[PDB]
Symmetry: D2
Subunit: 114 residues, 4 copies
C-alpha cells in the first residue's frame, strides 16, 4: 500500500540508491522503525510493507538526501527530507510518496489512489 | 520515447482526462501540431509518438490546466501550463514530462532515461 | 502591479541577471511585446509596468531560464519557463510571479493581492 | 539572520497565521526548542532570533501546515513540513526558509546569503 519515489531535478533522472527510512509514531510519541530500503534504478522503492502491517497511524518517511548529493560531489542544504502524514482507512488504499530533489530545495507530493 | 504525467496537488491524485497538446517548432518558428491526447486514470498519457517521428528539435507540451480546474469547480490562475524543451539524441532516449498542479502554482520536471 | 522573482534551487540564492519578457495577447490573437527586464541582485524584477498600462488582458511572462543556466555554463532541459494568465479582469490586482529553477525542473507560483 | 516565508498555492496568497517552531539539536541529540512564531499578513515570520543567539548547529524549522489547512476547514495530507539543515558552520549566514503549500504537497527552498 506504500511506495516511495525520488527524482533528481539537477540531472533530470531517477534518484538511485537513496536510503529511505519509514517510522510509525508509537503511543509514547517516539518514532519507531517501521520499514526501509534504497531506491532502485527507477528511483522507486517498492515492497516496504503490506496491507496487513500498514494500519492507520502517523508515519514519517525520511529520505537521506544529504548522502545522495555528497556522492555526486555536490554540497547540499538539508540534512534529509522528512514526509510526515496520517494513513487513513477511509481514503484510497495506495499511497505514493514522491520527492523531487535539488541541492537547496525539495518538493514532495502524495498520490493516493484506490 | 515521450510520456506526459499530470498530478493534482489539491486532491493528492492523478489529474485525469486533462488535454495535452504537443507541438514541434517548424523552420519558420511557428508551432506545428505534433501529437495530443487526454491523461488516463493514472494521470498518464502514453503513445504520443514513436522513436521514428520524435527527431531532435524543440517541442512544446501544453497542458490544459484551466479546463481541469474549472471542471472541479475551482478557479485557476494559469491559462495553461507550457513545457518547452529540446529533444537531443546524445542524451538518454526516453523523456517523461511530469507536472504537478495547484490552482495558483505548478511545478514541472523532466525524467530522462536510457 | 507586476513583479517577477526568480530563485536558484541549486545554489540556494536569488537567480540574478535573468532576462524576462512579458507579452500581452492582442486583438488578433498574437503575442504583442509588453515589457521586459532582468532580475536584480535580489532575484527581483520591479518596474515592468504601471497601473495605467497594465490593463485587463492575457499576459505571458517568459523567463529566459536556458540563457541563465548556460551563462553559468550548465546545459539545462527547458528553453524557458512561460507563465500565462488572465490579469485584472475583476479590476486592478497586484501580481508577483515567482519561479524556482533547477536545470531539469522549475516551479512557479503567483501571489495576487488587492490594493 | 533567520526568516521563514510561507505561501498558499491554492489561493495564490501569503499563508497567514501559520505556526512555526524552530528547534536546535542539543549535545545529547535531542531537539531543543529554539524559537517560534506565526507568519504575518505577508506570510513572513521575522524576528525569530539574533546573530548572537543563532550559533552553529543543526536546526529544524517545523511549519504547522496541518493546523493551517484545518483552521481553514480543509483536510490535508501532511502533519507538518519540517526543514532540517546545518547552519552557520562556515560562519554567520542569513537564511530564508520558504515553503509553498498545497493540501497534498509542499515545496521548500532556502535562500542563503553572506552578510
Ligand atoms: O512518477 C512521478 C511522480 Br509520482 C511525480 C513526479 O514529479 C514530482 C515528484 C515530487 C514532487 C513534485 C513533482 C514525477 C514522476 Br515520473
Ligand atoms: O519570496 C518568495 C520566495 Br523566497 C519563494 C517563492 O516561491 C517558492 C517558495 C517555496 C518553494 C518553492 C517556491 C515565492 C516568493 Br514571493
Amino acid at each position: 500500500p506504500l511506495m516511495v519515489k525520488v527524482l533528481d531535478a539537477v540531472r533530470g533522472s531517477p534518484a538511485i540508491n537513496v536510503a529511505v527510512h519509514v517510522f510509525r509514531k508509537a503511543a509514547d510519541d517516539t518514532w519507531e522503525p517501521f520499514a526501509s530500503g534504497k531506491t532502485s534504478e527507477s528511483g522507486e522503492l517498492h515492497g516496504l510493507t503490506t496491507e496487513e502491517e500498514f494500519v492507520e497511524g502517523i508515519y514519517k518517511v525520511e529520505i537521506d538526501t544529504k548522502s545522495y548529493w555528497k556522492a555526486l560531489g555536490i554540497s547540499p542544504f538539508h540534512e534529509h527530507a522528512e514526509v510526515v502524514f496520517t494513513a487513513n482507512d477511509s481514503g484510497p488504499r495506495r499511497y505514493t510518496i514522491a520527492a523531487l530533489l535539488s541541492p537547496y530545495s525539495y518538493s514532495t507530493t502524495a498520490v493516493v489512489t484506490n
